Write a protein that binds this ligand. Structure first.
Ligand SMILES: [Ca+2]
Ligand SMILES: [Ca+2]
Ligand SMILES: [Ca+2]
Ligand SMILES: [Ca+2]
Ligand SMILES: [Ca+2]
Lengths: 187, 101
């Protein structure tokens, strides 16, 4: 009958459509995976290039830091050599003709810092250089064998005391001095 | 009735036909899905090979670069000392001047 032919055609067309859609689906899935694979590899490569660049940039930063560390080390060693030479010169200074004058100047500065002082204290070898200066001021002179390269002033009856020492002057001022030196030498 | 027996037969062929069409459809799609999965797995592998190549090149270039810079560091240190030697005398007199009264 008519209905039977219609239904037979319905079954055929349902199967046909199932099969054509399955094929279209297969092709779409493959095409998609092709495009995805391609896009993935290209995106990845560009990302890799960028990373490699950053890697080289970090290495370079490391290298420059290494150069800066080297210059800072080298300056430091030079500065220490300067200090060593300064200390050797200061050590030799008491054998020189101008030592008495230096001693007198150190005593004056010690008195400026302790104007109430009643005595000046210096190494036994240095006292005779202060004799006249101390007499003019009216202050006593006292020997301290453990004392060198410096002069002490003492107030009261030993209540107060100020020291003017060349080595201690060097040591306390070295932080700033080293900056002045570096400007002179390099920067 | 032979009609009843042929109706049974016809039911049977309808079923086998629906089944056969469903299995062929499924196979087409499963085949494509597997081929797709292999395509993408292969692409990941190329990506990982390319990554490994970049990793090896990073190590090598970073080491060679830090070596060049160390050599530049050694030389720069030498330049520092050499340039200080010229004015050493002046530096020592400068400190002694600052430190003496
Ligand atoms: Ca037809
Ligand atoms: Ca037909
Ligand atoms: Ca047809
Ligand atoms: Ca003063
Ligand atoms: Ca000054």
């Amino acid at each position: 009958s008519k209905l039977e032919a219609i239904l037979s055609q319905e079954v055929e067309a349902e199967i046909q459509a199932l099969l054509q859609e399955a094929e279209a689906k297969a092709e779409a899935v493959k095409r998609e995976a092709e495009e995805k694979a391609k896009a993935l590899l290209q995106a990845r490569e560009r990302a890799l290039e960028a990373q490699y660049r950053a890697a080289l940039r970090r290495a370079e930063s490391a290298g420059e830091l290494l150069v800066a560390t080297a210059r800072t080390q080298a300056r430091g060693e030079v500065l220490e050599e300067v200090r060593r030479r300064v200390r050797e010169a200061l050590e030799a200074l008491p054998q020189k003709p101008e030592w008495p004058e230096v001693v007198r100047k150190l005593a004056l500065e010690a008195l400026e810092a302790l104007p109430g002082a009643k005595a000046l204290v210096a190494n036994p070898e240095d006292l005779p250089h202060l004799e006249a200066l101390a007499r003019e001021r009216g202050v006593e002179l006292q020997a301290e064998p453990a004392l060198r390269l410096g002069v002490r002033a003492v107030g009261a009856e030993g209540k107060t005391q100020v020291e003017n020492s060349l080595l201690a002057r060097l040591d306390r001022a070295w932080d700033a001095l080293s900056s002045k030196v570096a400007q002179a030498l390099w920067g | 009735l032979g009609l009843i027996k042929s109706l049974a037969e016809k039911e049977k062929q309808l079923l086998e036909r629906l089944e056969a069409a469903k299995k062929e459809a499924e196979e087409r799609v499963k085949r494509a899905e597997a081929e797709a999965k292999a395509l993408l797995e292969e692409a990941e592998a190329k990506a990982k090979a390319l990554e490994a190549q970049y990793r090896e090149r990073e190590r090598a270039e970073t080491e060679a670069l830090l070596a060049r810079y160390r050599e530049r560091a050694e030389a720069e240190a030498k330049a520092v000392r050499e340039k200080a030697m010229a004015r050493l005398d002046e530096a020592v007199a400068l400190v002694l001047k600052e430190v003496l009264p």
